[PDB]
Amino acid sequence: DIVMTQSPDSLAVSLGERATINCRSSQSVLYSSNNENYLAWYQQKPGQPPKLLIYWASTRESGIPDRFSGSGSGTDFTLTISRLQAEDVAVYYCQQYYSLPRTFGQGTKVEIK
Amino acid sequence: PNITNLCPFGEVFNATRFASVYAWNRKRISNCVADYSVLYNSASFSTFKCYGVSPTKLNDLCFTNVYADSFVIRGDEVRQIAPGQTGKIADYNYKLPDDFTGCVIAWNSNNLDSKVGGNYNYLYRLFRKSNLKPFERDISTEIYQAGSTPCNGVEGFNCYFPLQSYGFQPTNGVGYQPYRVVVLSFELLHAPATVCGPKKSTN
Amino acid sequence: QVQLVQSGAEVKKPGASVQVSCQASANTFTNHYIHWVRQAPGQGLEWMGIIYPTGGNTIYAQGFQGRVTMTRDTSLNTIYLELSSLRSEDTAVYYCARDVRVDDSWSGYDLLSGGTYFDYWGQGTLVTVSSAS
Ligand SMILES: *[C@@H]1O[C@H](CO)[C@@H](O)[C@H](O)[C@H]1NC(C)=O
Ligand SMILES: *[C@@H]1O[C@H](CO)[C@@H](O)[C@H](O)[C@H]1NC(C)=O
Structure with missing residues (x-):
């Protein structure tokens, strides 16, 4: 049932460096007809609700800066955050919208230095 | 009216x-x-x-x-x-x-x-010679050929029964x-x- | 000027009924589906169901098939819960996440295809249940 678990449970990121968040699905979300990889990436600060960052596999939604990036196809996908300098400490959720019931990831906490 | x-x-x-x-x-x-x-x-x-x-x-x-x-x-x-x-x-x-x-x-x-x-009474075709044309109600049930060798009308290597079961739960x-x-x-x-x-x- | 708000915090006894809900601007949310997402404080997100706002066609997750029913109100375009048989596992926040339908091809509603992704979320409505205050 599109069960899901991120490879990195938690990672300590040195400030200003690049950190990757691997995110593996149990079943491939790639759809043959249009060939768009159905994943989206979310981040929620404590208290606040999650905010989408990348809506397809790669392209980022309007309003977010170009710091974030994601790539991949099939089942292996990664969110690469570049130059982690701001207070972007949060828990990062990747989720399938290929089919119901929309199994979100367990979430991984990013830590500074 | x-x-x-x-x-x-x-x-x-x-x-x-x-x-x-x-x-x-x-x-x-x-x-x-x-x-x-x-x-x-x-x-x-x-x-x-x-x-x-x-x-x-x-x-x-x-x-x-x-x-x-x-x-x-x-x-x-x-x-x-x-x-x-x-x-x-x-x-x-x-x-x-x-x-x-x-x-x-x-x-x-x-x-x-x-x-x-569960239920195994629903079937779907997993192999075929080629793609269907629109509204092509193909109800073929013959053993599918997946290679050069003949299948001898029976299941075997490079020969799969074309219809598989969903098998819900x-x-x-x-x-x-x-x-x-x-x-x-x-x-x-x-x-x-x-x-x-x-x-x-x-x- | 935030354009999506919830019904506010609720507290209920186990076995009671809860009506977490969110009212929104109908001018733009006639053509957007709207989900419901759970999160326990220590666990991650969880999925509850989808509501087509006008027609009211609904789909629930298998884990809550016999525990929730969700309604509509076309005048306000607000949606409600009917989560019953509350228990200690039910303490969680409830966001009425939005969707954006991508395809201009088909008219009508499709709860399995035209969902796509969660572009907008409501403020958290934390629900707690306990024997006594
Ligand atoms: C439907 O129309 C005609 C009468 O004009 C006839 O078949 C029938 O009486 C009408 N329906 C009913 C329920 O009477
Ligand atoms: C199917 O049966 C139900 C109850 O008997 C009824 O409400 C419904 O209208 C029926 N379907 C159609 C297409 O009429």
């Missing part, structure tokens, strides 16, 4: 049994006043998805024929039932035309088309439960006919 004969939509939607996708049935709705507003307003249908003609416009536009192609497919495979899509159901079992004018109705059927112990996710489908592919032709909307006569 009023309808002359209500169409047999109850015979299709509320059918006692629904055929597998590889042998999808087709009910030729003909010469009847069709009420679509009763179907649209229903809260059971988890997917209506009218193409070409808007759903509310249906009740005063009308055609020569209406074919209610019906089958059973798990929920995540429902998107393949549409023009231009590609996939196992789209390629090997049921291909809609690239230019299409219909309404792919669907609804959850966990309580009807499944039981506590009540523990499956909501997207993986059995969703029935009805397509309603409209048609025009040289001969006029009036499978058409209600009278709408207030008096």
Whole structure:
């Protein structure tokens, strides 16, 4: 049932460096007809609700800066955050919208230095 | 004024049994006043998805024929039932035309088309010589050839029985439960006919 | 000027009924589906169901098939819960996440295909259940 678990449970990121968040699905979300990889990436600060960052596999939604990036196809996908300098400490959720019931990831906490 | 004969939509939607996708049935709705507003307003249908003609416009536009192609497919495979899509159901079992004018109705059927112990009575084609043409009701059941060597009409290496079973369970996710489908592919032709909307006569 | 708000915090006894809900601007949310997402404080997100706002066609997750029913109100385009048989596992926040339908091809509604992704979320409505205050 599109069960899901991120490879990195938690990672300590040195400030200003690049950190990757691997995110593996149990079943491939790639759809043959249009060939768009159905994943989206979310981040929620404590208290606040999650905010989408990348809506397809790669392209980022309007309003977010170009710091974030994601790539991949099939089942292996990664969110690469570049130059982690701001207070972007949060828990990062990747989720399938290929089919119901929309199994979100367990979430991984990013830590500074 | 009023309808002359209500169409047999109850015979299709509320059918006692629904055929597998590889042998999808087709009910030729003909010469009847069709009420679509009763179907649209229903809260059971988890997917209506009218193409070409808007759903509310249906009740005063009308055609020569209406074919209610019906089958059973798990929920995540429902998107393949549409023009231009590609996939196992789209390629090997049921291909809609690239230019299409219909309404792919669907609804959850966990309580009807499944039981506590599961159900293996639904089949789907996993191998074929080539892609289907539109509305190609191919009910082939011969052993599929996957190589140069002959299969000797029997299962073996490089030889697979073309139809496999869904095999549902009540523990499956909501997207993986059995969703029935009805397509309603409209048609025009040289001969006029009036499978058409209600009278709408207030008096 | 935030354009999506919830019904505020709720507290209920086990076995009671809860009506977490969110009212929104109908001018733009006739053509967007709207989900419901759970999160326990220590666990991650969880999925509850989808509601087509006008027609009210609904799909629930298998884990809550016999525990929730969700309604509509076309005048306000607000949606409600009916989560019953509350228990200690039910303490969680409830966001009415939005969707954006991508395809202009088909008219009508499809709860399995036209969902796509969660572009907008409501403020958290934390629900707690306990024997006594
Ligand atoms: C429908 O129209 C005709 C009468 O004009 C006839 O078939 C029948 O009486 C009408 N329907 C009912 C329910 O009477
Ligand atoms: C199927 O049966 C139910 C209850 O018997 C009824 O409400 C519904 O209208 C029927 N389906 C159609 C298409 O009329």
